[PDB]
Design a protein around this ligand. Structure first.
Ligand code: SF4
Ligand code: SF4
Ligand code: SF4
Ligand code: SF4
Ligand code: FCO
Ligand code: FCO
Ligand code: F3S
Ligand code: F3S
Ligand code: CL
Ligand code: MG
Ligand code: MG
Ligand code: MG
Ligand code: MG
Ligand code: NI
Lengths: 268, 551, 551, 268
C-alpha cells in the first residue's frame, strides 16, 4: 500500500529539527518512515550518498511531481549569489526552488526556515532569509520553534494525509492547534504572576517554590506556542518554564535570538 | 587514475564534500570541504556574556547540549566563577545521557548502512541468525521471532516499491562482507537502538526542559530548582523519574551496541589496518565533581607520535600548556586572515573565492596544537585513558577484544586501534563507560541533596570596564570542544569556537599539512570509483558534524 | 609680622600643626600641616579586594564605619555589583546613627570649650540659668536642680586642684562672651550629650557587631542574617531593640543640640562674618534606597562661586562629571610626585624633607575639582540641600534662625552661612535631619522583611585577569569621601582614599592656591598671640580629622 | 580626695581606642575623668592646646613623677629617625620615652601599640613598632584589640588603683581576665562547629540559623580574647560572630591584618 512521498532539504540547518523526530512517539521516527510516509529524500538517514542520492532526488521529483510534501529546515542564505550553502556544487536556494515547483505542500520546520531564526540574527552575516521569502508565490506552512515539538510537524503532515488539506492556520501560516495562543495566556504559573509571586534569581526561595519567571526574562507574554500544554518529550511536566528557566521566545520573530535572556517582555 | 567528488556525504550532520584522486584503484590524495557557513561567532558578538549559551547552542542540534555547556564554562572561566557541585552533577548527567543517545544513533542510524546490506538480510534464516548469538550476547530481543518480524518489515518495504531513504544503496557491493544472517541481526538492532536512544533523551529532557536544545543552564550554574518538598520543582518524584530512564540504557549498550562493535570488527578485520588520520591525539578531562570546576571522572591528555608511554596528562580546564598550544589557520579556508591565530585573537572574515585544489576549498578552519595536526574524538579519548592506565577503559576494551577473539581466534593490539575500526571501538567504549558516569552522578546528586545542599546557582557580576578572557573546554561526543570568550566593557568583544570536527575535518593547514579526514583516506581501496563506499566508511568513522566544524 | 605655631591642636582627631603670620593682631597668612602618616593606601595594596574594608576602616576610629562603607562601595563599583536593598537599609541606619554620635561629640566634647568658660559657670545663678530657657527649649533636664548638681561637680573638680584636661584653659580670655548662666547651661548639656551619643552607638553596635570599627559589611552587602523566626540572628526581638535606641536620640538633638547651636550664634554674631574657607562646595547624595545603588534620601551637588541658584545636581555615585574632576597634588606635601593626579592613577611616595614655608609642609595632599579648591562637609552639604530646594533642610535651618531671631531680633541670610558659625549650623542641621533618616530606614527595613525579602548578600566573583577600576562615594560626617580601587589579576594594584579633611586641610596646591583651613584663617583677630583661641575656633568648625586627612 | 593621674599619648593612632571610652558604662567616660582618675594629658579632650598643653604635660610629668599610668595608642614609627609622627616639632618616640621614665605603670591600649597592628602590616611603610619594642627596659601591659572592649582597659586601671598592682598577665603581658582563653574555646557556636553545621556564604540557610562561621574565615580558633563572653557595648548579644561575621583575629599578631577575611584558621 503506497505511502505519501516527502522530500526534506536542509539549508543552513543545525539538524535539531530532524533530531526532534528521534524524540517523537506518535509516530516514532521508525513508524514515520516505514508506515506513515515515504521519505524519498533526507540526507541524515539516506543509505545512498553523492551521485546516487542526487539520482534519488531527481527520480523522486519526477515520479511524485504534484504529490510530495517538501520540508525545509534552516535559513536560506542569499548573500553573494547563494554560495554560503552549496550542495553538489550549486546554491541550496536553487535546490529548494526546483523542489518547490512540484510540491503538493511546503513546510518550514523550525524558526530558521519559518522566519530566519538564529542564523539570520544580529548582523546576519550570510543574508539568511525564510523559506517563504525564497518562495513568494507559494503558501509555506510555518512550524516555528528551535526546534518545535516534533508532533507540531507530524500532526500537520497527518492532517494533510488523513483529511486531504492543511490544518487551520493563523495569519503567519502557523497551525492553530500548536501556535494559536500566547504561552502566557495558557501558563500554569499565571496565578503567581497575578499575585506578584516572582522568582528574582535562580535558586531563590520563590524559584524553589515554582513561582512565575517573568522577572527572570520570561518571553511567554509575547510568544505564540503550545510549550505549556503539549510541552516536550511526552514524559509529562517537561518544558523550559516547568524545569525552572524562562521562555526565551524561540518560536517568535523579534523575540528569540534578539532579546537577552533576562530582558523583560512586553505584557498585553 | 581519476578524480571523484562525493557531494553530498549523507548520514552525517550537515554539508560535506569529499574529493579523491584514485590511482591504481587506491585513494592517493583527498580534500575535505565544509560547504555551509552561518557565522555563529559573529552573531553572538557584542552581546551580554550570559546570553551567549542560548545562541551558540544552535551551532549544532545533533551535539545539542555541548556548545551550551562549553559557552557557560567559557563565561565562568572569564569571570572566575566556581560552579556549585549540584549544578555540575546536573550538567554531567545531561552530557552523559546526551552522549549515549549520540553514539548509539551514530553507530546504527548513521554508520551501519556502510557495513550492512539490507537486501542480503532478505536471504537470512532467522533461526540461524539467532543461533549465531548464543554465548555471544545475553540480550533478550535476539529471538528468531524478533528477527522474522524485522525481516517481514524489510520484505513489506521492498514489496511496496517505495524504498525512499533505503533506495539506490550499495546492495551487493564487493566490500559488503556480512552473511545474510548478520545483516538481519544488524537491522533488528538498528530498530531496537531507536528505543534506547529515546530513553537516553528522556533523561536529558527531565533536566534540560526539552531536547534538542536544553534550556536549564546559566552562567553561574543551572536553572533547576532543587527542593525535595516543592511542588512544580526538582523534587524526589522528578529525580526518581530521571533514575527510571537512566536504568533503561545499560542492557542495550552492553548486550547489543558493545557486541555489534566486536562483530563488525570480526567480519571486517582489514579495517583495523587502514583509516589512520594522525599520530597526535588530544582529549580534555570531563565530568567535574568538586566545588571548583575540577576533580574530573574522565581523564584527558596529549599523545605525540602515537607514544602512549610518554603522553602528557591534562587534569585541569585551566591548563596553560593546553590553552597556549591551540591555533587555527585559514590558508586553505574561505577566510581572509591566514596566519595561525590563537582563538582569543581569532577572526572569522569570510573570503569565498570558489574551489581551488591548492588554494581555498573549505569553510572549516585548520586547527593545530603547537604547530601539529591532531585527531580528537573517541579514538583520542580511548587512547588517552589507556595511556593513563584507567582500569575501567582497559577492562571495557578487553570485553570487546574477547568477543572478537571468540569469533576470529585472533586478538587486537593497540597498534590496530589507529584505524577506522579502532575509532569506532573508542566510541563504543565511551558509550559503555558513560553508563557508570550516569549511575555515579545520580547517586552523588541524591547524596548531596540529602546533606542539605540545594544550591544550584551563583549570580554573576560582570565588570563594566576591563578585558577578561575565558575558555570553556568540554569532551564532546566528537572530541575536545573549546569556546573562547573575550569580554570588554561588559560585552562579548570576541567569540571563537574551536570544535572537534574542526580539528578532524579541517583542510590543509598553514604548512600545507594534512588533517585527519584527508590523511585517513590515503591508501583506501576503491573497487568502484562511481560508488566509493570505502571512502564513506572511513569518513563516517570520525562522526562528521559540519554545522559544528564550520559554525 | 609675628609668627606663631599651634602644635598640637587639641580637641580634634589626630596630629595637626597650624602656623600663622599675624600683622597688627590679624592673621595675614596660615599653614595647615598633618604631622603623622601611616601609608594605609600602601598597606591595603596587593590584597584580595574583599579584604580592603576591614583594613581601611582603620584609617579613622572617630569616623568609624565611613571608610568601611566607602571601601565596599568602591569594590562593588569595580565589580558591577548591585547591593540588596536590605543591605542598603542596614548600611544607612549604621551611617546615620554613627553620624549622630559624631556630630554631638564634635559640638560638645571637641568644640564647646572654645566658646564656654567653665570658671565663669561657677559664678552662675542656676535658677536664672533655668529661667533663660523658658519658651526657648522644652528639654526636661534644664531645671535649676540639674544645673546646681552640674555646678557642684565643677566646684568639686576645681577644689581638688586636679583640673587635668580642664587645666590651663582659656578662662577669662577676651573672646569668651557668654554670661556665667550660659556657660553653666553649656556644661550641663556637655555632660547630657554623652548619654545621647552612647545611645546612638548602641544602634550602630546592634547592626555592626561592635563600635568602634563595625564588622558586618561585605563586598556584596552585609553579614547580618535576617530571619524574623531565627534564634541567634537578626530577628524581630533584635530589630525592636535597635528601634528602642533610635527613639532615644531625637529629644536631645532637637531640644538641646539644635537650641545650643542657635544660642551660640546669638552670643557670637561676628563669627557669622569670618572663617569663609572657599567659594566652591561639593557633597554627594547619600542613603541609597533602591536595588541599584541609587534613589538617595539626601541630595548632592556642586556649588561654584557661592551661587546656589546655578548649582549642578549630583544624583548618582557613577556621575562621570564628578569622577573626572577629582585630582590631588603633592607640590606642597611630603610626597614625590607633584603634578595633579586622578586617584585611579594616584601615587603616595613619601618624600619628607622637613618644613618649608614655600615648599613642602604637610602629609595631607591638595585635592581639586577641575582645578578649583573646594570646601566639603556640613556647610557644603547644607548649602547643596538649600540649592536643591529640600524643604526639610530649609525648615530645619528656619527653626535655628527663629531661636536666633528671638534672642537677637535679627534674621540670618544665606551670605552669613559662609562662615565659622554657618559651618557649625550646617552640622547641626545634618544631625537633626538624620533622625528622620533613621525612622524612615528602620520602617523601610521592617516593611521589606514583611514582604518576604530576607536577602542581604550577593557573592562576588573577581576575574583573575584584566584590570578594572571602581570608586565608592560616601557623604561622611566631615564631607564627601571617596575610595578609588584598581584591581589587576584579581588583587588591588592601586588604592587611593580622597577624604573630606584632605579637601579642607590640604596645603597650598599645584597652583599655590589656598585650601579651606588656610583661607578661613586670613582676617582672624588674635587678641593674645600666645593663646590664639580665635584661630582654634575657626579650625575646629571644620571638625579636623588628620588620620582621615593623611591616612 | 586626690585621683590617680593618667597621661595618654597617641602615636600612629586612629583614635578608635580613645573612642572606645565613649561606649563604656562602668565607668562612663564622664565618671572616669571626674571620679576615677585625673586625666592629666589627653589631646582629644584637652581644653588647652599648643604651648599651653605642652606646659600641662611638663607640669604633670614633674608633679606626678613615679605615680602616673602612661597609656599609648597607635604604633610608633622608627623609619627615617622618627619623622612619620612629629608633635611640637619632635618625634613621638621621644615624647613617649620621656613620659615612660616617670611612669608607675605603662599600658599599650589596642593592637597598634600592643604589637604594631594595622599600621605595621604589609610592607610597613613607616617602620611602625609596638610600645614594648620602644621601651625594652619596661614591662608594658598589652590590651589588644582594634579597639578592645574599653573595660578590658578600665578594669586593668581599676585593679592597679584598687589593689595596688596590675592584674595577672599571660606571657604576652595581656590581662588573663580578658585574654586568657581562645575565642573558639569559649564560643557559643562551638556546638555547630562540632556537628559540621557551617554557614558557607552570608545569607545562606545555615548563616540565617546562627551556625558556626569557621568556613567564612572565623579566626576564633587562633585568637585570644573575651569577645564571645564580655562582648561589646553592654547591650547584650553584640559581638562580630553573634552579628553574623567571622572573627578577623584583630587581637592577635599574625592573624588580624595579615590573614584574609575568608582565609581559614588553624584549629588546635
Ligand atoms: S530552528 Fe533551531 S533547531 Fe531547527 S535548524 Fe534552526 S537552529 Fe536548528
Ligand atoms: S511570565 Fe512566563 S512563567 Fe510567568 S505566567 Fe507568563 S508565561 Fe508563565
Ligand atoms: S588598635 Fe585599632 S582602633 Fe586602636 S589605634 Fe590601632 S587601628 Fe585604631
Ligand atoms: S570557628 Fe568561630 S564561630 Fe565557629 S565555634 Fe569557633 S570561634 Fe565560634
Ligand atoms: N560532538 C560534537 Fe559537535 C562536533 N564536531 C561539537 O562540539
Ligand atoms: N567624616 C570623616 Fe573622616 C574625615 N575627614 C572620613 O571620611
Ligand atoms: S524558548 Fe521556545 S521552546 Fe517554547 S518555552 Fe519558549 S517558545
Ligand atoms: S576581629 Fe577582633 S573584636 Fe574580637 S571577634 Fe575577633 S578579636
Ligand atoms: Cl531540598
Ligand atoms: Mg547568591
Ligand atoms: Mg571557530
Ligand atoms: Mg555599580
Ligand atoms: Mg589619599
Ligand atoms: Ni575621621
Amino acid at each position: 500500500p503506497q505511502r505519501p512521498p516527502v522530500i526534506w532539504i536542509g539549508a543552513q540547518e543545525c539538524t535539531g529539527c530532524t533530531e526532534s523526530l528521534l524524540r517523537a512517539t506518535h509516530p516514532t521516527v521508525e513508524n514515520l518512515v516505514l508506515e506513515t510516509i515515504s521519505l524519498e529524500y533526507h540526507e541524515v538517514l539516506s543509505a545512498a550518498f553523492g551521485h546516487q542520492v542526487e539520482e534519488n532526488k531527481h527520480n523522486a521529483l519526477e515520479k511524485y511531481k504534484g504529490q510530495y510534501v517538501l520540508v525545509v529546515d534552516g535559513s536560506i542564505p542569499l548573500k553573494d549569489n547563494g554560495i554560503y550553502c552549496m550542495v553538489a556544487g550549486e546554491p541550496i536556494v536553487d535546490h529548494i526552488r526546483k523542489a518547490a515547483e512540484g510540491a503538493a505542500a511546503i513546510i518550514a520546520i523550525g524558526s530558521c526556515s519559518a522566519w530566519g531564526g538564529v542564523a539570520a540574527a544580529g548582523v546576519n552575516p550570510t543574508g539568511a532569509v525564510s523559506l517563504q521569502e525564497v518562495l513568494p508565490g507559494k503558501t509555506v506552512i510555518n512550524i516555528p520553534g528551535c526546534p518545535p515539538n516534533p508532533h507540531n510537524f507530524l500532526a500537520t503532515v497527518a492532517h494533510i494525509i488523513t483529511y486531504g488539506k492543511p490544518p487551520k492556520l493563523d495569519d503567519k501560516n502557523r497551525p492553530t492547534f500548536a501556535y494559536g495562543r500566547l504561552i502566557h495566556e495558557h501558563c500554569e504559573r499565571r496565578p503567581h504572576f497575578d499575585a506578584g509571586r516572582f522568582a528574582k534569581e535562580f535558586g531563590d526561595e520563590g524559584h524553589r517554590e515554582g513561582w512565575c519567571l517573568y522577572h527572570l526574562g520570561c518571553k511567554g507574554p509575547e510568544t505564540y506556542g503550545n510549550c505549556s500544554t503539549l510541552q516536550f518529550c511526552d514524559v509529562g511536566g517537561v518544558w523550559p518554564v516547568a524545569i525552572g528557566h524562562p521562555c526565551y521566545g524561540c518560536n517568535e520573530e523579534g523575540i528569540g535570538f534578539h532579546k537577552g535572556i533576562h530582558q523583560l517582555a512586553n505584557v498585553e | 587514475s581519476q578524480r571523484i567528488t562525493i557531494d553530498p556525504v549523507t548520514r552525517i550532520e550537515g554539508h560535506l564534500r569529499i574529493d579523491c584522486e584514485i590511482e591504481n584503484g587506491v585513494v592517493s590524495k583527498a580534500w575535505a570541504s565544509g560547504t555551509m557557513w552561518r557565522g555563529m561567532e559573529e552573531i553572538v558578538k557584542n552581546r551580554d556574556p550570559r546570553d551567549a549559551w542560548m545562541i551558540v547552542q544552535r551551532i549544532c542540534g545533533v551535539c545539542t547540549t555541548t556548545h551550551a555547556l562549553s559557552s557557560v564554562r567559557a563565561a565562568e572561566s572569564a569571570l572566575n566563577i566556581d560552579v556549585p557541585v549540584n549544578a555540575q552533577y546536573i550538567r554531567n548527567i545531561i552530557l552523559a545521557a546526551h552522549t549515549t543517545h549520540d553514539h548509539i544513533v551514530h553507530f546504527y542510524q548513521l554508520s551501519a548502512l556502510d557495513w550492512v546490506d539490507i537486501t542480503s538480510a532478505l536471504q537470512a534464516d532467522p533461526t540461524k541468525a539467532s543461533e549465531m548469538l548464543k554465548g555471544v550476547s545475553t540480550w533478550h530481543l535476539n529471538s528468531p521471532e524478533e528477527f522474522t518480524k524485522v525481516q517481514n518489515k524489510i520484505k513489506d518495504l521492498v514489496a511496496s516499491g517505495q524504498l525512499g531513504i533505503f533506495a539506490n544503496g550499495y546492495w551487493g557491493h564487493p566490500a559488503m562482507k556480512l552473511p545474510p544472517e548478520v545483516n538481519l541481526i544488524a537491522v533488528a538492532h538498528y530498530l531496537q537502538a531507536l528505543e534506547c536512544q529515546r530513553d537516553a533523551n528522556r533523561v536529558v529532557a527531565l533536566l534540560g526542559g526539552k531536547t534538542p536544545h536544553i534550556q536549564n543552564l546559566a552562567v553561574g550554574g543551572v536553572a533547576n530548582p532543587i527542593n525535595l518538598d516543592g511542588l512544580g520543582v526538582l523534587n524526589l518524584e522528578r529525580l526518581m523519574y530521571i533514575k527510571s530512564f537512566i536504568d533503561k540504557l545499560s542492557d542495550f549498550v552492553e548486550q547489543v551496541y558493545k557486541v555489534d562493535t566486536a562483530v563488525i570488527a570480526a567480519f571486517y578485520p582489514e579495517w583495523l589496518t587502514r583509516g589512520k588520520g594522525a599520530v597526535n591525539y588530544l582529549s580534555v578531562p570531563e565530568f567535574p565533581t568538586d566545588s571548583k570546576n575540577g576533580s574530573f571522572l574522565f581523564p584527558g591528555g596529549y599523545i605525540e607520535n602515537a607514544d602512549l608511554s610518554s603522553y602528557r596528562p591534562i587534569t585541569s580546564h585551566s591548563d596553560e600548556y593546553l590553552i597556549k598550544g591551540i591555533q587555527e589557520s585559514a590558508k586553505h579556508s574561505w577566510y581572509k586572515d591566514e596566519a595561525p591565530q590563537a582563538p582569543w585573537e581569532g577572526t572569522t572574515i569570510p573570503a569565498y573565492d570558489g574551489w581551488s585544489d591548492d588554494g581555498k576549498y573549505s569553510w572549516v578552519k585548520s586547527p593545530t596544537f603547537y604547530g601539529k595536526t591532531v585527531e580528537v574524538g573517541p579514538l583520542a579519548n580511548m587512547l588517552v585513558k589507556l595511556a593513563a592506565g584507567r582500569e575501567s577503559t582497559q577492562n571495557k576494551l578487553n570485553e570487546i577484544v574477547a568477543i572478537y577473539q571468540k569469533l576470529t581466534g585472533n586478538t587486537l593490539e593497540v597498534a590496530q586501534l589507529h584505524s577506522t575500526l579502532g575509532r569506532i571501538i573508542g566510541r563504543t567504549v565511551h558509550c559503555c563507560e558513560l553508563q557508570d558516569i550516569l549511575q555515579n552522578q545520580y547517586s552523588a546528586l541524591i547524596t548531596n541533596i540529602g546533606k542539605g545542599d540545594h544550591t544550584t546557582f551563583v549570580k554573576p557580576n560582570i565588570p563594566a570596564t576591563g578585558e577578561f578572557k575565558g575558555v570553556g573546554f568540554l569532551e564532546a561526543p566528537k572530541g575536545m570542544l573549546s569556546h573562547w570568550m573575550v569580554i570588554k566593557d561588559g560585552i562579548i568583544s570576541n567569540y571563537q569556537a574551536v570544535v572537534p570536527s574542526t580539528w578532524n575535518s579541517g583542510p590543509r593547514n598553514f604548512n600545507d599539512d594534512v588533517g585527519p579526514y584527508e590523511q585517513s583516506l590515503v591508501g583506501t581501496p576503491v573497487a568502484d570509483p562511481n560508488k566509493p563506499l570505502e571512502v564513506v566508511r572511513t569518513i563516517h568513522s570520525f562522526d562528521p558534524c559540519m554545522a559544528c566544524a564550520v559554525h
